[PDB]
Design a protein around this ligand. Structure first.
Ligand SMILES: O=c1cnn([C@@H]2O[C@H](COP(=O)(O)O)[C@@H](O)[C@H]2O)c(=O)[nH]1
Ligand SMILES: O=c1cnn([C@@H]2O[C@H](COP(=O)(O)O)[C@@H](O)[C@H]2O)c(=O)[nH]1
Ligand code: PRO
Ligand code: PRO
Ligand code: PRO
Ligand code: PRO
Lengths: 256, 256
């Protein structure tokens, strides 16, 4: 096993993955904030205050009540300042011809501001081929959804294996996975894991939690994605620091 | 097998399914236009001209360059005038807590104007439970994606069976399927089939076509979803009429 900083230099590394791994190493953070808020001002105030603590900020811009492209310009300023990537959690999941338009166009123009997006693999590899027609020229990366943290997830078994093959066959655009554990043996691929809280439990709509120590340390993932464990806390900066320290130490202990 | 008009009266029919089946019977149409355009004016001019020929208009509002809620008000006026349902093809595919916000909120406020939406079943039944928290109070319906028409689709076998069970267990909100064929034996559920053209072939991003006669007549589906076979034709009204007549006659011949 290689450090994040060494993985950033692997021959086949994608440039977006390399940038991410280098800032993870520099800042001692493998935390992705899931900025699940409906107000632009709250999104930007969280990005500014928590920026030093995170490697990545994950958006759902289709839940912002006051989205504009100017908001995303301001988010990019903060991402550049504090050094984190922007990941729009759009879960593209249509045929290739449709997802290319959903990625480039409409009101959101996702490809213009998102370093990373993700896709479900259920449509077959055309979903990746459609996204990459927009994302390759714009030097973007994509994450494939190999597993989900929710109760009754069908992203298991042969479905998960199909995601790894699709990633490993589109490695010029696909930089890794959303997964609950390491699913690829290739160190060039990132593993990002949602369904993370310090305490046991879940929500009332199928979300299930595991700890940073479990998912980074035992399950071999790279990055934790944390929403409500931070966002619902009173002091979101201290909460982010607790999650950062948990994920970072779990990584160091597994690296040995 | 029952006619559309008789299915509209089944004991367990959902009100949105009943409204749809009654207007299908009245208008002799089982065609859903896939209005895959980027301009509001083109969307509205297609809705007005083709409204009499269709049972449903399927949107991707995240591809409109000039989306506003006023555009959707104008679309509703046309839907009421010509008698068709509005189906936003959003393919919700997140955990329940996230999809409820994506359905109700953000810029699009999908639940405020869409009679129907669809969901992938990959997250497990929490995706339906989250949508239904918004959609049940608003008297909306949902379609579950049981199959996809694209090359390499993983919506097969046990995945398709899981979609049918999830639909049949959330029948107060789920009104049917996106599928390539009949997948439920319960006549209360609608089957809508994309990947339809009169001529053989596909696109260069994994789309595959079958004919209206094949999918309605042989494969037992209810409604054809047609995008480019209409949208790319010079005369979209004549193209819509050719698809309507094809799908309607295939239905009548199987009913016998
Ligand atoms: O398998 C999952 C589970 N959750 N999420 C996303 O990660 C965040 C989890 O939020 P939470 O920490 O508040 O539960 C939410 O934005 C959710 O859409 C995923 O991408 N995949
Ligand atoms: O399995 C599929 C295939 N296509 N679509 C959608 O139906 C339309 C198919 O368009 P087409 O007729 O132009 O190929 C597009 O909007 C596409 O997103 C689905 O919902 N499911
Ligand atoms: O010096 C560094 O940060 C990188 C890490 C691995 C080797 N070079
Ligand atoms: O299970 C619960 O409800 C709380 C909230 C998530 C962590 N523990
Ligand atoms: O009269 C009608 O239109 C409906 C159809 C089935 C029986 N009643
Ligand atoms: O296969 C093709 O390219 C054309 C367009 C769809 C139907 N036939």
């Amino acid at each position: 096993e290689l450090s994040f900083g060494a993985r950033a230099e692997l021959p086949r590394i994608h440039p977006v993955a390399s940038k991410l791994l280098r800032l993870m190493q520099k800042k001692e953070t493998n935390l992705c904030l899931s900025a699940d808020v409906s107000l632009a001002r709250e999104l930007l105030q969280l990005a500014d205050a928590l920026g030093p603590s995170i490697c990545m900020l994950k958006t759902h811009v289709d839940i912002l009540n006051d989205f504009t492209l100017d908001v995303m310009k301001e988010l990019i300023t903060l991402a550049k300042c504090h050094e984190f990537l922007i990941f729009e959690d759009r879960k593209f999941a249509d045929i290739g011809n449709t997802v290319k338009k959903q990625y480039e166009g409409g009101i959101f123009k996702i490809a213009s501001w998102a370093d990373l997006v993700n896709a479900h693999v259920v449509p077959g590899s055309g979903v990746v081929k459609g996204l990459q027609e927009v994302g390759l020229p714009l030097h973007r990366g994509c994450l494939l959804i190999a597993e989900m943290s929710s109760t009754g997830s069908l992203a298991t078994g042969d479905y998960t294996r199909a995601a790894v093959r699709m990633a490993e066959e589109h490695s010029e655009f696909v930089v890794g996975f959303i997964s609950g554990s390491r699913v690829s043996m290739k160190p060039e691929f990132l593993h990002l894991t949602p369904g993370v809280q310090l305490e046991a439990g879940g929500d009332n709509l199928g979300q299930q939690y595991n700890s940073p120590q479990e998912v980074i340390g035992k399950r071999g993932s790279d990055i934790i994605i944390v929403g409500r464990g931070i966002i619902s806390a009173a002091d979101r900066l201290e909460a982010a620091e607790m999650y950062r320290k948990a994920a970072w130490e779990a990584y160091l202990s597994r690296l040995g």
